[PDB]
Amino acid sequence: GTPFQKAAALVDLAEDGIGLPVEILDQSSFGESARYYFIFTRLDLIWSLNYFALLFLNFFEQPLWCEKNPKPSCKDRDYYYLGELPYLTNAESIIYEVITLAILLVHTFFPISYEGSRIFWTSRLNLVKVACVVILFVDVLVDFLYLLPFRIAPYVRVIIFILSIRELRDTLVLLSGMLGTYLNILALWMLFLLFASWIAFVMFEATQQGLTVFTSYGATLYQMFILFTTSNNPDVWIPAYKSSRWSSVFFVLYVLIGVYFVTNLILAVVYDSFKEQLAKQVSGMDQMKRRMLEKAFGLIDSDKNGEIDKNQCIKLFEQLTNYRTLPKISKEEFGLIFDELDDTRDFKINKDEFADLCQAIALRFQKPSLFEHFPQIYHSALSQQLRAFVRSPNFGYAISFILIINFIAVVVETTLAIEESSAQKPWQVAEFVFGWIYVLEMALKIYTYGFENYWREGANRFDFLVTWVIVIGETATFITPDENTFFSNGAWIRYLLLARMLRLIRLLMNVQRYRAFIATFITLIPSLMPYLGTIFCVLCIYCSIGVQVFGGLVNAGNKKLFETELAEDDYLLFNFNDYPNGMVTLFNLLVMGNWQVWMESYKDLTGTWWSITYFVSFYVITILLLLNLVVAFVLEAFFTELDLEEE
Amino acid sequence: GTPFQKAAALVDLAEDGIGLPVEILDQSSFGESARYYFIFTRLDLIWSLNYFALLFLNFFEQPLWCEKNPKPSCKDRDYYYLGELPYLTNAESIIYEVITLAILLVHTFFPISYEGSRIFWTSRLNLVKVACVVILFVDVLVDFLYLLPFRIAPYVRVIIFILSIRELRDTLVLLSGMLGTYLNILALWMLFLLFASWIAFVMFEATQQGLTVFTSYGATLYQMFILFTTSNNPDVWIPAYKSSRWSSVFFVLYVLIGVYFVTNLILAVVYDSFKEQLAKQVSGMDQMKRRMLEKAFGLIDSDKNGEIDKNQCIKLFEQLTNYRTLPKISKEEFGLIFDELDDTRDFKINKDEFADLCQAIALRFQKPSLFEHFPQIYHSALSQQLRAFVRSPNFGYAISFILIINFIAVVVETTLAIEESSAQKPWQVAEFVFGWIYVLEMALKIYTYGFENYWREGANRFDFLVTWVIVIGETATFITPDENTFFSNGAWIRYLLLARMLRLIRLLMNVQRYRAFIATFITLIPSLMPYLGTIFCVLCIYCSIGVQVFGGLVNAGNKKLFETELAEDDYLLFNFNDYPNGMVTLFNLLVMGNWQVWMESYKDLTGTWWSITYFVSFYVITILLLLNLVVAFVLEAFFTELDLEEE
Ligand SMILES: [Ca+2]
Ligand SMILES: [Ca+2]
Ligand SMILES: [Ca+2]
Ligand SMILES: [Ca+2]
Ligand SMILES: [Ca+2]
Ligand SMILES: [Ca+2]
């Protein structure tokens, strides 16, 4: 047991909670565990692809109501308002499930090799993983034997995907703590709805608005709930306004208080409670991080001198460079990290000074040209003029001028979109020239800045990709002037025109005051993914429930469907017949635009009032809790960055 | 010229920028100005009532399109979908205008008495006031002579009302300061809209969604703006979804990015700019206050010793107690404030120590019973038992039990809302007893805590007034069992139930966590008044413009009206025919619920595309600027209070 290997393992554990068990580093036969751990970590791309394949299977499964015998077979894609995604047959679904299940089974039960026996079977996460895998295997076996109330696999495989990502696991734990305070503010919100309905039920008792809308307290409470979202504001109290113009005062007060006071109060409480959960998690994670780093320091210094020498600190680096979960470190970066690590400036790292290792590792990002091989070409009299001009401030001025000319060429080309293909070639030739100029621009930039220096920053790598993607398509259209099924097609021409448009957005980066706002938007999406992924997983669960409950009520032969608001508004294509169909239907309810049409219509098709619990719970869980959390993220991101420049 | 009088005037100026001119305190004949200033300030209630009456005249004026000769006379209130507020005849309008104009003219030109001659005519605010008064007088004279393109008096009197209140003027100044940054963010929003519209127009060129919705670039931009409002989300791209389910991805991306990113960025920018404006205004006002207080202190101390004695300070107190714009101060409050002001504890107030006078004045609010006159009654064994019981914690428990019994009685009474008046008498008697026992509670509370100590708090006064208002109504209903036109009416019974339900709301204060939120809302309402008044004035201006432009297009005989979205949705009662009608029509656009129905319909009635400039500018000015500001205020208040409790 080499102490440096254990120190590297402890550093890997300190970077994030994922790693080797703590109690096996000093245990005998540790290398046999490290080897299997490295082998397991070499296949993380395969594991992630398998998990995404399991997640994306719900989109391609035949709906459960098709497993029965409807009067027309559901291959009639127009009768049920289905569309555009194929269904997997029995053989295809069976083989896909078998392959994915085998890979998942290998992934789940492999940690037992480097975790021993008792440690694997005493972890709650491993226990729930094994339980989910066993449930999925039993479901697959039952399905194979049949070829049953309902198919439970869709829910299970979504759960497996959620717990397979560390960020998705963390979000659910945080939401668990919020559940106490969130339920508290829902009771206050519920009391406001309950009493406001009581006032409106007795006020409009014998009036015209109580004989058609507020027929009973349940009807009143139902209508006052929708009014709280301002989805039917003028519609609901037309009869009250037609019989008395003073009745509008009550509804004006209710909407104003409901929207500005109550709705904003929920957002403030949700964000405040969630922000408290970060403090508990971050402090706990950081406290664990420093404990692991401190323990690693003790292993390295067996002499108890208190500090590590230069070579000993270096020897740690090549031991921790075998891990793929740690930032890449070069050979010359070894001194760079040690130079930056030293805070007391004594050629030695201290115990409390060593606790800033993980932050130090991924902070260097610096440092030399391959065009310096021949000094008779690069160092020329005319070369300096080119070198001066490319680095001159007018270089951007010239490129901006070219972009403006390109902008003029694009807008005039889009104007002649109804003309035939006879006059499109002259503009194609002009666009052909514009493609190579930008390639010439980026190639010239490589000649001056170098190759490796040109590739260091991540933003330029995106510019490298988009420049090459658009030029190969542009030149492919020109080198093939005869008729083709891939270059003269209407779809290909449209894609070409869009590509040049997304090139023109670069002009918007010239405005510094606008460029800052775009940069904030770009840097926010990576940090918003775990919360956006949770919303996607919640939609997946709700989509599976919607298909199983509201399966085939929207047909071309239903009689009660054409009397509902769904048919009158021509929303028949937004149903819960498919998984893709229900995935975009839940997006329409996500934005709360005409959202009560589906809630009203599916209540009539099911014929029961219990069906509205599907939509009420979706609004409460997703709109009020998850979307309000995402909204609060965008505000806090802008508020901190905006105030930063004035400081 | 008594120096204490000038010191009191300077303190009045320090409290707020409204007061006597600075350069007349040392000028000769100062008392002749102070007397007129006090006389002017004694009539502030009359001035405020006159200003509010002038503002409220727009609601009672006959619309200008009625001044012409429509085919039916507009006394037929149903033909034009008018309703419920009377029109002032020529004589009534003339006399009301004369009275208001006379009072306003007296108010405007009275300051010239205590401001001299040259000072009055060199102030920009006074010049604007005089110009507005002259314009209003000219309009009144022209109207009298006639009995003309249009009447300008509505806008002028709205402006007069706006500039007659300091808070509205401050809000306007801050908005003028913000205008540049608001335009800066609007330009980026417009660029985003234009780019998205270009992409959508080109990409759906020859598709079914481009032959019915995106017919041209202007129509595409219009529909993309409405979609950014998310008022027609599923409707706009139904043809695209019907021809290709993958087309929904573009619209999903547009809606998500637009709404979240752009809306929250605009809100953040507006809030940041307004906070900067608040910082500037507060800094300037505080600097002016300190300068005025320093000048007053310099005036008081003519001996240049550096500190003021006690008697001189008390003399300042009863010299400044003559102003009605300053907080009330009693006799012992003189010594109380003198003791509280002393920070160095030396029986003397210092130069910088005196600058904390305005804050100290309205901070005492303390300090004794009138029931102590007879010690043979108040001091008794049973009296002691009652005093112990009322102040005991079980007093609240018993009152809560009584209120719960009242809740049961009220709910069972409301259950039998369809029954006749024969069985309502027992419940009327029960609620009669409830009202009297509540009055007994209030009287006993007065008896135990005293009279003045009971009247010190404000919520206690509110409880007193509401209890008396409900009990007088209950007893008036009970003592008249025979048929009456005021006590057996259904409206009276409904009012009684509504009054009782608020008493039933008193129980909501028992929950501490809900009581904190309610108190936060209650203390938030006063601080939001200037912004709500600014929104109200903007709504008044827009209503006047809408009545002037969209006057009588909504009739019962129009042919192009029944083909519009206004008639199909049965929104015909929400038009711009009246001032009351337009005032509630603008509220429907305020909440952005089905808001494009009016924008679509009036474009067809006017027959021009310029009419949408009325609705777009309303959305930009009101929804994106003022309502966002109110929302930001609510969020920041809730956040600060919340974070205050965990601290
Ligand atoms: Ca790790
Ligand atoms: Ca050492
Ligand atoms: Ca050191
Ligand atoms: Ca004053
Ligand atoms: Ca003195
Ligand atoms: Ca002192």
mmCIF file of N, CA, C and O in Angstrom, chain A residues 29 81 102 125 128 184 196 206 215 335-336 395 528 612:
data_model
loop_
_atom_site.group_PDB
_atom_site.id
_atom_site.type_symbol
_atom_site.label_atom_id
_atom_site.label_comp_id
_atom_site.label_asym_id
_atom_site.label_seq_id
_atom_site.Cartn_x
_atom_site.Cartn_y
_atom_site.Cartn_z
ATOM 1 N N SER A 29 -4.626 -5.514 0.348
ATOM 2 C CA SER A 29 -5.053 -5.734 -1.032
ATOM 3 C C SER A 29 -5.837 -4.531 -1.557
ATOM 4 O O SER A 29 -7.017 -4.616 -1.904
ATOM 5 N N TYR A 81 -54.958 11.227 -33.660
ATOM 6 C CA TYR A 81 -54.167 12.459 -33.585
ATOM 7 C C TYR A 81 -52.769 12.184 -33.037
ATOM 8 O O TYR A 81 -52.215 12.963 -32.259
ATOM 9 N N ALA A 102 -28.660 -5.410 -19.714
ATOM 10 C CA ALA A 102 -27.376 -6.062 -19.482
ATOM 11 C C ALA A 102 -26.304 -5.040 -19.125
ATOM 12 O O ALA A 102 -25.528 -5.239 -18.180
ATOM 13 N N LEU A 125 -27.619 3.982 -1.184
ATOM 14 C CA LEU A 125 -27.668 4.251 -2.618
ATOM 15 C C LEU A 125 -27.501 2.968 -3.422
ATOM 16 O O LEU A 125 -28.240 2.727 -4.384
ATOM 17 N N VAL A 128 -30.780 0.897 -3.118
ATOM 18 C CA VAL A 128 -31.887 1.352 -3.956
ATOM 19 C C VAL A 128 -31.577 1.109 -5.429
ATOM 20 O O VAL A 128 -32.476 0.797 -6.221
ATOM 21 N N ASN A 184 -46.238 24.707 4.039
ATOM 22 C CA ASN A 184 -46.731 25.757 4.923
ATOM 23 C C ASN A 184 -47.322 26.916 4.131
ATOM 24 O O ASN A 184 -48.377 27.453 4.486
ATOM 25 N N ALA A 196 -61.954 33.478 -0.232
ATOM 26 C CA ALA A 196 -62.378 34.322 -1.344
ATOM 27 C C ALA A 196 -63.521 33.671 -2.110
ATOM 28 O O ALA A 196 -64.415 34.355 -2.620
ATOM 29 N N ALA A 206 -78.168 34.823 -5.525
ATOM 30 C CA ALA A 206 -79.338 34.806 -6.392
ATOM 31 C C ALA A 206 -79.150 35.657 -7.642
ATOM 32 O O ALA A 206 -80.116 35.891 -8.375
ATOM 33 N N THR A 215 -72.364 28.221 -9.202
ATOM 34 C CA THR A 215 -73.542 27.429 -8.864
ATOM 35 C C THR A 215 -73.452 26.851 -7.457
ATOM 36 O O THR A 215 -74.466 26.774 -6.755
ATOM 37 N N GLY A 335 5.537 22.081 -11.441
ATOM 38 C CA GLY A 335 6.115 23.218 -10.745
ATOM 39 C C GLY A 335 5.151 24.383 -10.637
ATOM 40 O O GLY A 335 5.159 25.117 -9.646
ATOM 41 N N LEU A 336 4.314 24.573 -11.661
ATOM 42 C CA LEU A 336 3.375 25.689 -11.658
ATOM 43 C C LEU A 336 2.376 25.574 -10.514
ATOM 44 O O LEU A 336 2.078 26.566 -9.838
ATOM 45 N N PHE A 395 -8.167 45.458 -37.325
ATOM 46 C CA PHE A 395 -8.486 44.109 -37.778
ATOM 47 C C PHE A 395 -9.947 43.776 -37.505
ATOM 48 O O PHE A 395 -10.650 43.244 -38.369
ATOM 49 N N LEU A 528 -27.619 25.961 -14.606
ATOM 50 C CA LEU A 528 -29.060 25.769 -14.528
ATOM 51 C C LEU A 528 -29.494 24.378 -14.973
ATOM 52 O O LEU A 528 -30.673 24.039 -14.833
ATOM 53 N N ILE A 612 -59.088 16.228 -12.366
ATOM 54 C CA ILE A 612 -58.453 17.534 -12.224
ATOM 55 C C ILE A 612 -57.315 17.518 -11.218
ATOM 56 O O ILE A 612 -56.516 18.464 -11.187
#
